Amino acid sequence: MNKTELINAVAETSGLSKKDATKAVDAVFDSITEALRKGDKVQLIGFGNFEVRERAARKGRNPQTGEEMEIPASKVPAFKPGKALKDAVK
Amino acid sequence: MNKTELINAVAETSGLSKKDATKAVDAVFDSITEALRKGDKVQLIGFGNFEVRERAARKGRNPQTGEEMEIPASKVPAFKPGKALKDAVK
């Protein structure tokens, strides 16, 4: 696919519009980027469970670094195959 | 989410129907499952690149599973954050 073969899937399976299928992809995927970016779990039953991995902020202080500070986290994005896709694909 | 907080995202961002947003989720996610189950790759610009990993046939011990067995193929599902989501979420 690419993101446009996505639009022709939606509009073939449902009978919306080509403009409504372009929006509807950036309707799923716009609410998911706001889920992972804000520390929030999504959910898709029988197919996929997305969530983020916020790493544990470290300690860099004095004999190791010089200045006292906790080294910040970062959230990492992921998609589970909901278990169910792992049976579809085996 | 769950799969129904999905339907209210689509129908709020686009103005389709609640029945058209339920279909349009199992429109995108029906075409990923035809990519992943059949060997094909998906594609989404600014968000993702899903693709399956077909196992390379052997007769021996421990590639994916940690057990002694006959290996001949098995497709394993994946989702890339398109690089672009990895910048959103950092």
Coordinates of C-alpha atoms in Angstrom, one line a residue:
Chain A
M1 CA 0.0 0.0 0.0
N2 CA 1.2 3.7 0.8
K3 CA -1.7 5.8 2.3
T4 CA -3.7 6.2 -1.1
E5 CA -4.3 2.4 -1.6
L6 CA -5.7 2.8 2.0
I7 CA -8.4 5.4 0.6
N8 CA -9.5 2.9 -2.2
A9 CA -9.8 0.1 0.5
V10 CA -12.2 2.2 2.7
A11 CA -14.3 3.5 -0.1
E12 CA -14.6 0.0 -1.7
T13 CA -15.5 -1.8 1.6
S14 CA -18.0 0.9 2.9
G15 CA -19.2 3.2 0.0
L16 CA -18.3 6.6 1.6
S17 CA -16.3 9.1 -0.5
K18 CA -12.6 9.2 -1.7
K19 CA -12.3 12.5 0.3
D20 CA -14.2 10.8 3.4
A21 CA -11.7 7.7 3.2
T22 CA -8.6 10.0 3.2
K23 CA -10.0 11.8 6.3
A24 CA -11.1 8.5 8.0
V25 CA -7.5 7.1 7.8
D26 CA -6.2 10.5 9.4
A27 CA -9.1 10.0 11.8
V28 CA -8.0 6.6 13.2
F29 CA -4.2 7.5 12.9
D30 CA -4.6 11.2 14.2
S31 CA -6.3 10.0 17.5
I32 CA -3.5 7.2 17.9
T33 CA -0.5 9.7 17.5
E34 CA -2.3 11.8 20.2
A35 CA -2.7 8.5 22.3
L36 CA 1.1 7.5 22.1
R37 CA 2.3 11.1 22.2
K38 CA 0.3 11.8 25.5
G39 CA 1.1 8.5 27.4
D40 CA -2.3 6.7 26.4
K41 CA -3.2 3.2 25.3
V42 CA -5.4 2.8 22.1
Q43 CA -7.4 -0.5 21.4
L44 CA -8.6 -2.6 18.3
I45 CA -10.4 -5.9 19.4
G46 CA -9.5 -9.1 17.5
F47 CA -6.5 -7.4 15.6
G48 CA -4.2 -4.9 17.6
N49 CA -3.4 -3.2 20.9
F50 CA -1.1 -0.1 20.6
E51 CA 0.7 1.5 23.5
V52 CA 3.9 3.5 24.3
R53 CA 7.1 2.5 26.4
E54 CA 8.2 5.5 28.6
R55 CA 11.8 4.6 29.7
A56 CA 13.0 5.2 33.3
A57 CA 14.7 8.7 33.6
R58 CA 18.3 8.2 34.8
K59 CA 20.6 10.0 37.3
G60 CA 23.8 11.9 36.0
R61 CA 25.4 13.6 39.0
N62 CA 28.9 14.8 40.2
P63 CA 31.7 12.0 40.1
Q64 CA 30.1 10.7 36.8
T65 CA 28.9 14.0 35.1
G66 CA 29.8 17.1 37.3
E67 CA 26.3 18.8 37.5
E68 CA 23.4 17.2 39.4
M69 CA 20.4 16.3 37.1
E70 CA 17.9 13.4 36.4
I71 CA 18.4 12.5 32.7
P72 CA 14.8 12.7 31.0
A73 CA 12.6 9.8 29.6
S74 CA 11.3 9.0 26.1
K75 CA 8.1 7.3 25.0
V76 CA 8.6 4.6 22.3
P77 CA 5.5 3.5 20.0
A78 CA 4.3 0.0 19.6
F79 CA 1.5 -2.1 18.1
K80 CA 0.6 -5.6 19.5
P81 CA -1.1 -8.1 16.9
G82 CA -4.0 -8.3 19.5
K83 CA -3.0 -12.1 19.9
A84 CA -5.8 -12.7 17.3
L85 CA -3.8 -11.4 14.2
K86 CA -0.9 -13.7 15.6
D87 CA -3.4 -16.6 14.8
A88 CA -4.5 -15.2 11.3
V89 CA -0.8 -14.9 10.2
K90 CA 0.9 -18.1 11.5
Chain B
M1 CA -9.8 3.1 23.2
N2 CA -11.1 -0.5 22.4
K3 CA -12.4 -0.4 18.7
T4 CA -15.7 1.6 19.4
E5 CA -13.8 4.8 20.8
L6 CA -12.3 4.4 17.3
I7 CA -15.9 4.7 15.6
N8 CA -16.6 8.0 17.5
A9 CA -13.1 9.4 16.4
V10 CA -13.9 8.9 12.7
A11 CA -17.4 10.1 12.7
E12 CA -16.3 13.2 14.9
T13 CA -13.3 14.2 12.6
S14 CA -15.1 13.5 9.2
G15 CA -19.0 13.6 9.6
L16 CA -19.8 10.1 8.0
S17 CA -22.0 7.7 9.9
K18 CA -21.4 5.6 13.2
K19 CA -22.2 2.5 10.9
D20 CA -19.8 4.0 8.1
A21 CA -16.9 4.6 10.8
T22 CA -17.3 0.9 12.1
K23 CA -17.0 -0.4 8.5
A24 CA -14.0 2.0 7.7
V25 CA -12.0 0.6 10.7
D26 CA -12.6 -3.0 9.4
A27 CA -11.7 -1.6 5.9
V28 CA -8.1 -0.3 6.8
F29 CA -7.6 -3.3 9.3
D30 CA -9.2 -5.8 6.7
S31 CA -6.5 -4.7 4.1
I32 CA -3.6 -4.9 6.7
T33 CA -4.9 -8.6 7.5
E34 CA -4.9 -9.4 3.7
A35 CA -1.3 -7.9 3.5
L36 CA 0.0 -9.8 6.6
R37 CA -1.9 -13.1 6.1
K38 CA -0.9 -13.2 2.3
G39 CA 2.8 -12.1 2.5
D40 CA 2.2 -8.5 1.2
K41 CA 3.3 -5.1 2.8
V42 CA 1.0 -2.2 3.8
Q43 CA 2.0 1.5 3.8
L44 CA 1.0 4.8 5.6
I45 CA 3.0 8.1 5.0
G46 CA 3.7 10.1 8.3
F47 CA 2.7 7.2 10.6
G48 CA 3.5 3.5 9.6
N49 CA 4.8 0.6 7.5
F50 CA 3.4 -2.8 8.5
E51 CA 5.0 -6.0 7.0
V52 CA 5.2 -9.8 7.8
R53 CA 8.4 -11.9 8.5
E54 CA 8.1 -15.3 6.7
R55 CA 10.5 -17.8 8.5
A56 CA 13.4 -19.2 6.4
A57 CA 12.8 -23.1 6.3
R58 CA 15.2 -25.4 8.2
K59 CA 15.4 -28.9 10.1
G60 CA 17.1 -28.4 13.4
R61 CA 16.9 -26.3 16.7
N62 CA 15.8 -22.8 18.0
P63 CA 15.3 -19.8 15.6
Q64 CA 12.0 -18.0 16.8
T65 CA 10.9 -20.5 19.6
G66 CA 13.8 -22.2 21.6
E67 CA 12.7 -25.8 20.7
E68 CA 14.0 -28.8 18.5
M69 CA 11.6 -29.0 15.4
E70 CA 11.0 -28.9 11.5
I71 CA 10.9 -25.1 10.7
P72 CA 9.2 -24.6 7.0
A73 CA 7.8 -21.0 7.2
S74 CA 5.7 -18.9 9.5
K75 CA 4.7 -15.2 8.8
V76 CA 5.2 -13.0 11.9
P77 CA 3.4 -9.5 12.0
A78 CA 5.0 -6.1 12.5
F79 CA 4.2 -2.3 12.4
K80 CA 6.9 0.4 11.9
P81 CA 6.1 3.9 13.4
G82 CA 7.0 5.3 9.8
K83 CA 10.0 7.1 11.4
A84 CA 7.6 10.2 11.6
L85 CA 5.5 8.8 14.6
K86 CA 9.0 8.1 16.3
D87 CA 9.6 11.9 16.0
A88 CA 6.0 12.9 17.3
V89 CA 6.4 10.6 20.4
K90 CA 10.2 11.3 21.4

